[PDB]
Design a protein around this motif. Sequence first.
Motif, mmCIF file in Angstrom:
data_model
loop_
_atom_site.group_PDB
_atom_site.id
_atom_site.type_symbol
_atom_site.label_atom_id
_atom_site.label_comp_id
_atom_site.label_asym_id
_atom_site.label_seq_id
_atom_site.Cartn_x
_atom_site.Cartn_y
_atom_site.Cartn_z
ATOM 1 N N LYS A 96 15.768 2.858 -16.225
ATOM 2 C CA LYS A 96 16.626 2.281 -17.250
ATOM 3 C C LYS A 96 17.652 1.344 -16.626
ATOM 4 O O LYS A 96 17.957 0.291 -17.187
ATOM 5 C CB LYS A 96 17.330 3.386 -18.044
ATOM 6 C CG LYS A 96 16.388 4.196 -18.922
ATOM 7 C CD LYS A 96 17.125 5.284 -19.686
ATOM 8 C CE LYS A 96 16.162 6.120 -20.513
ATOM 9 N NZ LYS A 96 16.859 7.202 -21.256
ATOM 10 N N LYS A 97 18.184 1.722 -15.467
ATOM 11 C CA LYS A 97 19.162 0.879 -14.790
ATOM 12 C C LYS A 97 18.484 -0.393 -14.292
ATOM 13 O O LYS A 97 19.056 -1.480 -14.374
ATOM 14 C CB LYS A 97 19.806 1.626 -13.618
ATOM 15 C CG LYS A 97 20.815 2.685 -14.042
ATOM 16 C CD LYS A 97 21.476 3.335 -12.837
ATOM 17 C CE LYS A 97 22.505 4.373 -13.255
ATOM 18 N NZ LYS A 97 23.640 3.772 -14.012
ATOM 19 N N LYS A 98 17.264 -0.254 -13.781
ATOM 20 C CA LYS A 98 16.516 -1.408 -13.295
ATOM 21 C C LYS A 98 16.263 -2.379 -14.442
ATOM 22 O O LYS A 98 16.385 -3.593 -14.275
ATOM 23 C CB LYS A 98 15.185 -0.966 -12.681
ATOM 24 C CG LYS A 98 15.278 -0.587 -11.213
ATOM 25 C CD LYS A 98 15.566 -1.815 -10.357
ATOM 26 C CE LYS A 98 15.656 -1.464 -8.879
ATOM 27 N NZ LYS A 98 16.779 -0.526 -8.599
ATOM 28 N N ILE A 99 15.910 -1.834 -15.604
ATOM 29 C CA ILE A 99 15.652 -2.644 -16.791
ATOM 30 C C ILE A 99 16.918 -3.395 -17.175
ATOM 31 O O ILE A 99 16.878 -4.583 -17.500
ATOM 32 C CB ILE A 99 15.242 -1.767 -18.001
ATOM 33 C CG1 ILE A 99 14.030 -0.912 -17.644
ATOM 34 C CG2 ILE A 99 14.963 -2.644 -19.215
ATOM 35 C CD1 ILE A 99 12.917 -1.673 -17.024
ATOM 36 N N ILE A 116 19.401 -4.280 -15.281
ATOM 37 C CA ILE A 116 19.650 -5.350 -14.326
ATOM 38 C C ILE A 116 18.704 -6.517 -14.592
ATOM 39 O O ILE A 116 19.104 -7.680 -14.498
ATOM 40 C CB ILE A 116 19.480 -4.855 -12.875
ATOM 41 C CG1 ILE A 116 20.564 -3.822 -12.557
ATOM 42 C CG2 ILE A 116 19.561 -6.032 -11.904
ATOM 43 C CD1 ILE A 116 20.452 -3.211 -11.172
ATOM 44 N N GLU A 117 17.456 -6.202 -14.938
ATOM 45 C CA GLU A 117 16.457 -7.228 -15.239
ATOM 46 C C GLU A 117 16.915 -8.061 -16.434
ATOM 47 O O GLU A 117 16.813 -9.292 -16.428
ATOM 48 C CB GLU A 117 15.105 -6.582 -15.571
ATOM 49 C CG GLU A 117 14.411 -5.882 -14.406
ATOM 50 C CD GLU A 117 13.857 -6.851 -13.378
ATOM 51 O OE1 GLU A 117 13.042 -7.720 -13.754
ATOM 52 O OE2 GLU A 117 14.233 -6.742 -12.193
ATOM 53 N N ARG A 118 17.414 -7.379 -17.463
ATOM 54 C CA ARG A 118 17.887 -8.044 -18.672
ATOM 55 C C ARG A 118 19.096 -8.923 -18.377
ATOM 56 O O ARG A 118 19.193 -10.045 -18.877
ATOM 57 C CB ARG A 118 18.252 -7.011 -19.745
ATOM 58 C CG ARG A 118 17.074 -6.198 -20.275
ATOM 59 C CD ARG A 118 17.538 -5.195 -21.332
ATOM 60 N NE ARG A 118 18.070 -5.863 -22.518
ATOM 61 C CZ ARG A 118 18.716 -5.249 -23.506
ATOM 62 N NH1 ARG A 118 18.922 -3.939 -23.457
ATOM 63 N NH2 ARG A 118 19.156 -5.946 -24.546
ATOM 64 N N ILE A 119 20.017 -8.408 -17.568
ATOM 65 C CA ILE A 119 21.216 -9.159 -17.205
ATOM 66 C C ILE A 119 20.828 -10.448 -16.483
ATOM 67 O O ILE A 119 21.374 -11.517 -16.763
ATOM 68 C CB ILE A 119 22.145 -8.319 -16.299
ATOM 69 C CG1 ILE A 119 22.793 -7.204 -17.125
ATOM 70 C CG2 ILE A 119 23.215 -9.205 -15.670
ATOM 71 C CD1 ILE A 119 23.620 -6.234 -16.312
ATOM 72 N N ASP A 120 19.884 -10.344 -15.553
ATOM 73 C CA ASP A 120 19.428 -11.513 -14.805
ATOM 74 C C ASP A 120 18.823 -12.557 -15.743
ATOM 75 O O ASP A 120 19.065 -13.756 -15.596
ATOM 76 C CB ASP A 120 18.389 -11.099 -13.759
ATOM 77 C CG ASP A 120 17.809 -12.287 -13.016
ATOM 78 O OD1 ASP A 120 18.563 -12.964 -12.288
ATOM 79 O OD2 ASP A 120 16.595 -12.547 -13.165
ATOM 80 N N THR A 121 18.044 -12.096 -16.714
ATOM 81 C CA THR A 121 17.407 -12.992 -17.671
ATOM 82 C C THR A 121 18.433 -13.677 -18.576
ATOM 83 O O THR A 121 18.334 -14.874 -18.850
ATOM 84 C CB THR A 121 16.395 -12.221 -18.534
ATOM 85 O OG1 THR A 121 15.418 -11.617 -17.682
ATOM 86 C CG2 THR A 121 15.698 -13.158 -19.503
ATOM 87 N N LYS A 147 26.963 -0.560 -20.931
ATOM 88 C CA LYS A 147 26.122 0.524 -21.435
ATOM 89 C C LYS A 147 25.301 1.224 -20.356
ATOM 90 O O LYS A 147 25.206 2.454 -20.339
ATOM 91 C CB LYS A 147 25.170 -0.002 -22.514
ATOM 92 C CG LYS A 147 25.850 -0.540 -23.761
ATOM 93 C CD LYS A 147 24.817 -1.008 -24.777
ATOM 94 C CE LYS A 147 25.470 -1.514 -26.052
ATOM 95 N NZ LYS A 147 24.456 -1.984 -27.042
ATOM 96 N N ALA A 148 24.707 0.443 -19.460
ATOM 97 C CA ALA A 148 23.870 0.996 -18.399
ATOM 98 C C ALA A 148 24.637 1.393 -17.143
ATOM 99 O O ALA A 148 24.097 2.076 -16.272
ATOM 100 C CB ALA A 148 22.771 0.001 -18.039
ATOM 101 N N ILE A 201 26.490 -6.482 -11.849
ATOM 102 C CA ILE A 201 25.893 -7.781 -12.117
ATOM 103 C C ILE A 201 25.350 -8.301 -10.788
ATOM 104 O O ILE A 201 26.029 -8.224 -9.766
ATOM 105 C CB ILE A 201 26.941 -8.775 -12.665
ATOM 106 C CG1 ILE A 201 27.508 -8.248 -13.985
ATOM 107 C CG2 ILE A 201 26.308 -10.150 -12.855
ATOM 108 C CD1 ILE A 201 28.573 -9.131 -14.593
ATOM 109 N N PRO A 202 24.113 -8.820 -10.782
ATOM 110 C CA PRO A 202 23.513 -9.343 -9.549
ATOM 111 C C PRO A 202 24.458 -10.284 -8.803
ATOM 112 O O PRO A 202 25.224 -11.023 -9.420
ATOM 113 C CB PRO A 202 22.264 -10.055 -10.057
ATOM 114 C CG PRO A 202 21.849 -9.186 -11.204
ATOM 115 C CD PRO A 202 23.169 -8.923 -11.908
#
Length: 106
Positions: free
Chosen positions: A12-15, A17-22, A51-52, A56-57
């Motif tokens: 969930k955390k990886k997701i 981070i993925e969303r934030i990057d996008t 939320k997560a 931020i990258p």
Amino acid sequence: IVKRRDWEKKEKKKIAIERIDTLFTLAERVARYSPDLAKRYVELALEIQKKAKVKIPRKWKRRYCKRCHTFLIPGVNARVRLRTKRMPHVVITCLECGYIMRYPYL
Ligand SMILES: [Zn+2]
């Protein structure tokens, strides 16, 4: 169940981070033409972060104003300077609201 819950929590955390990057990628693409939309994407990314409970990258952490949330573009709405009297650091000034942010150069 300990391992299962751990795997789900990590994914969930990886997701997140993925969303934030996008979202930041989209913000950068639309920022020059549609700054209000870029600000919206930045805020959606900040909501996910909250939320997560993730960071931020590194490639995006300095690219938005912490005060007004506008996406920062050097020359357009951001001034980037380096100071080295003591600890070398990057000084980024949001030109839209004047907020100043500092980061270690090293
Ligand atoms: Zn600002």
